[model samples]
Target chain A: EKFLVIAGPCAIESEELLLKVGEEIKRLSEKFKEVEFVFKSSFDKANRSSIHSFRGHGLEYGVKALRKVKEEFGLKITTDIHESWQAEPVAEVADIIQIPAFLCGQTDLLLAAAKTGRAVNVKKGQFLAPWDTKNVVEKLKFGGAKEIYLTERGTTFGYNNLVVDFRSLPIMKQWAKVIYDATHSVQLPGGMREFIFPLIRAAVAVGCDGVFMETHPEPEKALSDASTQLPLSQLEGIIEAILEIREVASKYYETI
Target chain B: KFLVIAGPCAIESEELLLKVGEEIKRLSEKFKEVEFVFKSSFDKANRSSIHSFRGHGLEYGVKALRKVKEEFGLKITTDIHESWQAEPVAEVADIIQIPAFLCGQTDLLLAAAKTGRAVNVKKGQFLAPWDTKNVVEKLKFGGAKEIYLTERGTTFGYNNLVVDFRSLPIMKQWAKVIYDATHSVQLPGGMREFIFPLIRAAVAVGCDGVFMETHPEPEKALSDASTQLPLSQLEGIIEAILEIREVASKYYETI
Candidate 1:
């Protein structure tokens, strides 16, 4: 069982950026051979608060570009799908299909992705109780999904705040693999990023199976989720720090 | 501007409610600016475990509340569950509370509002503090003017709850905000009680008031025994919170 770290831009802005980020993440994977890396990016930024927000390249172009990244880099790919119809096409290239937190409850979407037989990761909804996701996990299993994972992004606190409860990791892990979405967990709605280091450390310490973080070569210039995306250059240090924490965590896991 | 909503989790008996009410009244007198609202519940409709005691039913529970109010001559508050219970319970209780689980139920909220009593709504564990604005609207729509918001605890993982203090300032924008010390510290099916620190945190975060449930013997209490504070411990807790509030409000007053 390898610790998975899903890394990529929040959304695939262009083929050039996607390939560039993928190549850099591959470099990080080679440098830190201890953990498995899964590249994740959203093809469709479907749940943007406003309609004016950028919604990525449509399914046809995005999936094609993702397929190219997988073929060229030989790295496992993961991307988010908005509609039920996009699941098959996205799964054709993406190794894992992600259900966005806002749409995790859409039964048809979960079933569609499950039928594709690709690994499915459903983000716990901001408005739901952690245990309530057991029903969502049941839906994925009932859909015949062989590989299921739960991601704890963050729960809605106020107008635009999200609070990630570390306790959610052990609780959700009982049903399936649990990933802590570090980037999204620190989001202040329309604000800056804080707690990336402490959050990732706590996630690993609490025994999360993986971490989903959006990164870019130039995060401030990224098209979507600019506020939360990690700069690609900073990824190496955090990964090293995470590895050290995981080392001590390995011993803690035994006692628990 | 100062208010403290204190009482037992449920009206266990006339003697208990009166004893709790008298102690609270005495605390309010010592602290001149703070107005105290005697709080208790008639029915524990939403206990996590069905086997847990549901408290004295409407008639007996409300009667006990009325006795405490008359004897202590204090303003009283108690939660109302059903639409029919609203008018009757509101008659005795000075403030009618909308329980957290039922906060989004428009009919229940409307009935509580229609009684023309001050309403205190606990933020639902499933709801965002911002989303509670819509709930506040429902109360206003029902023609209720005075509204209060309380932060108890949000469902964290499995059977636990966590209080995000950031919600205090956020909700304060809509109405006076209250922090439920006892419930916020609840481990939810776990053995430990951790309220004092959070009570101080709430005061420091600028909450208008505090709400807590205290029993004569918390361990021996029939309902919410795990979370309720001991009756004897009430004075020390409130005194400490007041001192912290004075210190916090002194420097952090303008916000």
Candidate 2:
């Protein structure tokens, strides 16, 4: 009956930036009691295909930044991790320790994240099949995770593109809680800005327990994923849109 | 208006290769002007399951491709997994084919180009249409004059593939585009779906060629059984496509 919202910038540029970005979600949480908000940003951009890409401020200062947002805004926090040792430290701050899609199949990281007793949300890999997530489901279940969530960002299409397959939402839902990642699902657009609206709304109507998105005040200047981040200014409208669609989908659409 | 480069998914043996080759020769004669290239893989390096069958390796493989050409008087095409294969394959294969996954690798592009043989590169399932210009540049730099680009359907979620008809027109900007009828249907766990409709759609979209897999007994064929057309359906599928190609040409010339 409740909805989970994991929203943040792609990576932390600084403590000030984290607080600056978390400001609106802090307001959205109070306005929509129906939605649970988690302030998210990665401490490291460990898997970027480009060597030239800027990774965020590393672990120590990164969590210190997340702690500031958590303490000040009273918002739950989520951030992805690439290695096993990071699970404990990240769990200290992250309400959910996300497994990057590229490393979703790595057993040690899943085991380590599960050991922390914080919720573990593993993303489906771009190359992995939908039904194939049975292995991923069992791995998290076997690890004694307090809560297990799987996120579908998008699947790889022809070189350097990604597509949202609505079918995956129901397929993955069979095994664990499913979260739809809106921004990451749209790629290589020549205006990711135009796509974020329909994709987010579709996820809400078609149905998922939660939605994931990255937003920046000045999106064109974001440190990473600048091409696809939703403008923070537009975040409020998206929430209202999601709220309206869910109301209609739940009331009339039993199939969804 | 359209071309066909097809054969079994992999070369099972010399007898089977010659059998398919003989039938293909007859089809070419009946069709008259339609271009046909005998296509089969010497090695299927990128299969869904690791345990699936592979083709005859290079030396004997090239030998088999040569026999098909020598015996049946048909041009031949085969795919290569690595850069080293370009030179040796060029010795016999009229056109050196590049697998979809390796379409963007610079080394392979440059190597295949240098061989002075026509090259057909399947656009990667992970690539956008305009991005193929870079591949065009690589082949140009390697000095290849006869260049082709193929659309085998992009990754539509997982375990399935769909032809983005838009890609046919978009990629035509770089090189003549081919619709890979069989592999495009491969379910990523992989299978062939809608073999005829997909080919019909691709030709309608102005593809210069169609690359498909065919077999006399597909179920008994060693690999990629699901996508191969039964030899019985071959002539019928071609007749329908020929009619579509003619209508397409009529409008295409005026435009």
Candidate 3:
């Protein structure tokens, strides 16, 4: 029943930026008391398409920044880890550790995160069947972890496109909680400032436990994932729409 | 721009295969222009449940396919799982099909291409439609001049599949695209029968062809029983598809 949200910049650009982003989301959480918020950002963009892209502040600096945001805003923190060794360090500051979609199948990384006793949100891989994710979920459960979440970012549509299948929201919720990654699900992939509404509508109508989005004060100026990130100023309007859609969609969830 | 590959999911028996082929021949005459290709698989190598029935093996399967081709005067098509099976299948089948799950296998694509027969490579459930260009290129690079592409369905959730209608137009740009109506409707671990809406949608979206499986008594079908359309219903369904295709052609002349 908890409609949770995981929101932050795409990557931790700096301690100053991370705090500003975290504080604003915390303010929104206060405004919308019905929803729970988890502050999220990646310490390292390990799977960047090009090597020249920004890779985020490394673990130590990123974690330090996250710890400060947690202290300053009192919001639960979440971030992604690309390798096995980065898990414990990230779990030190993050309430939830994310398994990047590309690395969802790596056993060593799953076990490492499990050992940390933090919730793990594993994004379904573009190349993996939805049902087959049970095998990956089982590996995490076998690792002695308690809380687990399955997030659908989007499936690969072409060389550079992604399409979100709404059916995934209900299907994945059978095993664990499911989160719809709204911004990243677009093709060539909209306007928070017109494109993502239908996808968000589908996600809610299909019944998802939560939604994940990246927000920035200036998305175009953001260092990474500039195209897909939603502007933070528009978060209130997006949330207002999602709340209405979720309320209307609640009746169908029982039947689905 | 014209191909409709229709038949049983797997080769069951000679009588059943011939009956389905003959029924299709009559339907084709009524429609007057749609090209029909008989589709039957020799091996369903990747069934999720091992307890499920496979089909008549290669020698018997090829013989039945050849009999259908000879008797109905229809072009025959069947799928091949391994590279070695390609030559034998190509000999009997007018067009060789590469199963969706095996679409990305380089060796299998090359072997099917080298036969000088038209190859229909299915888009993988895990692969995006645009990425299928790589698979199509592999077929063309391997010596295939004629090629076809199919969109069966993509993996949505555990044991479920969803059809992205946008994929039809996206893939049509790469090669002639076909919609696997029956398989795309499958719930996988559950029911495979809820697909008529999508089949109609494909026709409207400008798919050049459709691939469907039919059995005389669907409930008694040995393989893919849940998804196969009943033979008696095939005429009605094909009639509806053609009507919709005509409507789609009128407004979208550019496609």
Candidate 4:
């Protein structure tokens, strides 16, 4: 029943950067009395639209920094898993191993991460509906993990774009703690901007239990997904607006 | 009711290039009942993606396109990205189709028109049907010989784009309108959702001939290969569209 907000950069730019972002997001979440927090980041970006696209710091470099962020900030951390090979080391630092939407159905990857005994968040593939993610969920459970998190990134749009369907939140919630991820969904190729307000409203309206997003102090200077990630200062305003919408909807559950 | 647009992804190696031209000409021969315009892209504007597939630089690509025209004996069409690109691409292409996103660009349109190659303009996804009047006027103002309009799809909520069939007639007053039937249904997860709906709607409206993207095995084709139809299904989709076209034409012609 805990409402959660997970925030961080789309990838670990550096240890100094991670520390700075973590401290800020941690402080922001404490302002809302009822919510929990998890710091999220991707250590290795294996999937770029084109091969020439930038991936993040190598895994060893990213994991060490994430480990420090968790240790110093006293917060749980999440990062994505692309293959079985990435699972063991990433699990050493990340409290949750997220299976990216593109790699959600990889049996070996799910097993490796699940066996780590850490919470596993499997993103529903953009190509799949909410129910289709159950097969992915089952793969993790059979591998021995009990706690599971489901995420909605976005779906393929046209030509080479992606879109988010907010209905996926409540629908995926039937199986796991559904998380709405904002940062990756807004990405436009070669650093373009997109309208993010509609997606935010849709996520909250559809009843997401947790929300994941990336914020940078200087987004334009950040390395990956700068087009989609919001400036860190805007985080508080955006979260407060979503909370207001959630409060209004709560009244409809009714009382005598 | 007359025109076939066909071409290769890039010039590739000359062997693959010539082979594609020879094969496309062979295929279009069966369609002698209509006009056939061969297509290929000398330079892919938006393909900063995947580092590979953009055809030879415009120079080599245009040269290859000329080879296609000479060998195949078909009218050729190719894409242009910028104003600077028009003259060179026009040098080889019989018709120059502007990319969708660049439709509103003033200089590019005028440059293509100045070349006198028939301009086949694709409507921008972000624009409405009525918005294309500006595009038509640009070409006419340039004193272009002819213009053809093609509809791919329109940007919907996000990531996804949808084809609005009503746009065909809405735009027809300016020029001959062709509905790209193949790309119309080209949604992400196979053509399970939006493809047929667009085709049916397009046929109901009654426009020029269909623009289809077909391949021997769509699942294996490169580029937009996933959305292109299996070469086998082309006839069925075409037949259904023609049936609808006949009914519409008959009903409207008598009026």
User: What are the per-residue Cα lDDT tens digits for candidate 3 across A1-256?
Assistant: 7789899998999988888888789899999899999999888888776788899878999999999999999999999998888988888889999998889999999999998999999989887767788888899999977999999978875466566555556567678888988777663531222335445544664467899888888989999877778888878877866676566435435333
The lDDT values for all models are: 0.80, 0.81, 0.79, 0.71
Interface RMSD, candidate 1?
11.5
Measured by lDDT, the strongest candidate is 2
Instruction: Compare candidates 1 and 2 on DockQ and give the better one.
Output: 2
In the range B13-77, model 2's lDDT, one tens digit per residue, is 87889989988999999898789999988886634333457666888889999999999889989
Q: After superposition, how far is residue B138 of candidate 1 from its true place, in Å?
A: 38
Scored by lDDT, model 1 comes in at: 0.80
Cα lDDT for residue B202, candidate 4: 72
Which predicted model would earn the best TM-score?
2
- Most accurate candidate by DockQ: 2
Ranking by lDDT: 2, 1, 3, 4
Look at candidate 4 and give me any clashing residue pairs. A157-B159, A157-B160, A158-B159, B4-B37, B6-B39, B7-B39, B185-B195
- Residues forming the 10-long window of minimal summed lDDT in candidate 2 chain A: A46-55
Q: Which candidate model has the greater DockQ, 2 or 4?
A: 2
lDDT measured at residue A74 in model 1 versus the true structure, 0 to 100: 86
Q: Which model, 1 or 2, shows the larger lDDT?
A: 2
Docking class of 1: incorrect
Instruction: List model 4 lDDT by residue over B88-144, tens digit each.
Output: 888778889987656655656778999988999877654567767667877888778
lDDT tens digits, residues A116-213, model 2? 99998888877668788867767667777858888988888665667788888888888888899888888652136678888888887888889998
Docking class of 2: incorrect
User: Cα deviation of A148 in candidate 2 (Å)?
Assistant: 22
